[PDB]
Design an enzyme around this catalytic site. Sequence first.
Site, PDB file in Angstrom:
ATOM      1  N   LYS A   1       0.863  -6.972   6.043  1.00 14.61           N
ATOM      2  CA  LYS A   1      -0.491  -7.483   5.916  1.00 14.61           C
ATOM      3  C   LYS A   1      -1.344  -6.597   5.004  1.00 14.61           C
ATOM      4  CE  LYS A   1      -0.407 -10.527   9.841  1.00 14.61           C
ATOM      5  NZ  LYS A   1       0.913 -10.069  10.355  1.00 14.61           N
ATOM      6  N   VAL A   2      -0.828  -6.382   3.797  1.00 14.75           N
ATOM      7  CA  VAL A   2      -1.432  -5.425   2.875  1.00 14.75           C
ATOM      8  C   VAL A   2      -2.874  -5.825   2.554  1.00 14.75           C
ATOM      9  CG1 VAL A   2      -1.155  -4.277   0.676  1.00 14.75           C
ATOM     10  CG2 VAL A   2       0.855  -5.071   1.922  1.00 14.75           C
ATOM     11  N   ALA A   3      -3.813  -4.895   2.707  1.00  9.83           N
ATOM     12  CA  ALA A   3      -5.222  -5.263   2.665  1.00  9.83           C
ATOM     13  C   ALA A   3      -6.087  -4.116   2.173  1.00  9.83           C
ATOM     14  CB  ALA A   3      -5.677  -5.722   4.046  1.00  9.83           C
ATOM     15  N   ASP A   4      -5.668  -3.514   1.072  1.00 12.70           N
ATOM     16  CA  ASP A   4      -6.398  -2.377   0.526  1.00 12.70           C
ATOM     17  C   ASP A   4      -6.887  -2.700  -0.877  1.00 12.70           C
ATOM     18  OD1 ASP A   4      -7.235   0.442   0.082  1.00 12.70           O
ATOM     19  OD2 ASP A   4      -5.941   0.826   1.817  1.00 12.70           O
ATOM     20  N   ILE A   5      -7.424  -1.697  -1.562  1.00  9.64           N
ATOM     21  CA  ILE A   5      -7.856  -1.848  -2.950  1.00  9.64           C
ATOM     22  C   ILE A   5      -6.619  -1.978  -3.841  1.00  9.64           C
ATOM     23  CG2 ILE A   5      -9.878  -0.454  -2.476  1.00  9.64           C
ATOM     24  CD1 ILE A   5      -8.612   1.836  -3.971  1.00  9.64           C
ATOM     25  N   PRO A   6      -6.790  -2.480  -5.067  1.00  6.04           N
ATOM     26  CA  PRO A   6      -5.618  -2.714  -5.914  1.00  6.04           C
ATOM     27  C   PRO A   6      -4.671  -1.514  -6.075  1.00  6.04           C
ATOM     28  CG  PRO A   6      -7.499  -3.847  -6.818  1.00  6.04           C
ATOM     29  CD  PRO A   6      -8.021  -3.019  -5.671  1.00  6.04           C
TER      30      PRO A   6
ATOM     31  N   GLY B   1       9.906 -15.084  17.525  1.00  7.03           N
ATOM     32  CA  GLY B   1       9.906 -13.693  17.933  1.00  7.03           C
ATOM     33  C   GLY B   1      10.363 -13.530  19.371  1.00  7.03           C
ATOM     34  N   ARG B   2       9.409 -13.494  20.297  1.00  5.13           N
ATOM     35  CA  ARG B   2       9.710 -13.302  21.718  1.00  5.13           C
ATOM     36  C   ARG B   2      10.753 -14.273  22.258  1.00  5.13           C
ATOM     37  NH1 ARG B   2       4.994 -10.109  22.972  1.00  5.13           N
ATOM     38  NH2 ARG B   2       3.567 -10.639  21.246  1.00  5.13           N
TER      39      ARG B   2
END
Lengths: 207, 208
Positions: A68-73, A187-188
């Site tokens: 869930k990558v969610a940082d600056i470029p 999943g579960r």
Amino acid sequence: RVDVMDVMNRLILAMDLMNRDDALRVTGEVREYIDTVKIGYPLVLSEGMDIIAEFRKRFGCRIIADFKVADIPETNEKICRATFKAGADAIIVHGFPGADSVRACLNVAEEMGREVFLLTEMSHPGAEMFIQGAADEIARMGVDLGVKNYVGPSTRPERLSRLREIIGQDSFLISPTLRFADAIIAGRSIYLADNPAAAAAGIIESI
Amino acid sequence: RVDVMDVMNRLILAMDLMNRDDALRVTGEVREYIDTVKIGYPLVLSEGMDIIAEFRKRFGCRIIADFKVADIPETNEKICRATFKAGADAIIVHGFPGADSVRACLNVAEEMGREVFLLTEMSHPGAEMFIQGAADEIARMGVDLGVKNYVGPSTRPERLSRLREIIGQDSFLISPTLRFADAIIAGRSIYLADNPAAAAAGIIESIK
């Protein structure tokens, strides 16, 4: 579609267990049924990024890193590079931080011959506050960037039809239904089953 | 404020280098000036989560894990637990996924005696599309969750004033200015400097 990934039996295992012994035991037991495993931070932070290469070498499976990558470029670029260097075939990235943050991921994926999945929406209760209202625009942003792989809502079939309308019939869509998504994620239902192999077998039957 | 963390010299080092040797070398050299280091995924994915304990045991510094946690509640809980178990003093978490996702982090922080920082906004160009418009509401959500620590916009001072208005004068605010934020974060200005120790010393002098 030839140009998007083939997921065996249209069933992805979400391997969300946090200890390496349990995770390895389950994944190997279902390798006859599933060739694509999604792993997230709980396992990799607990056991190390080396576990990615271990899954691939022991089971020959595709690995999707649900980070869930969610940082600056610039930081997104580094996260993707580290993740692909560790052997991930694909990485899931948030769209909320905007187009240049997604493009940074696309850039590294193209360099390294890997895939980016754009997360368009989430289905947990708090998703209503900000994510739900942005979902269609995030999906459109993906299409405009040439994104080919998408992760859609877990619940609400009519949300899948809307996503499919935006992304077109060619793009690859996975959902945690198969009228719209190319593959489903379990999943579960599997990793908490007494007989994971049997559980996988059963889901595949109904598919 | 007695109840929020004291950051030495109001200056946090953003240690964004990805190789352990370079990272350790810079942090040790500035330990005289800085007691609080922010670590992100580039370093920990490359070198292992064990590097957190190494920073703390070698330098005695506080570690803030800039992991921008942004998953569903159950997964957020597990990420926070793994991160705090590895020794992080605090973790940075996104607000965009909503209140239950933030609360999950607060729960684990409460259990383990650690801290959650809410990221209210971002300053990179694409932040305009969705983040900027949500920032005030995310900050308000934090206040209504009893969040005490916030990460604000890097740019735009007038944004800091607005955030400080929402969160009150008591909460802890860090920013990449000190009329509003309790501490500032320096990264390249330090870790790419000829001598980081001197670089840190310099910034500190500017801070009165």
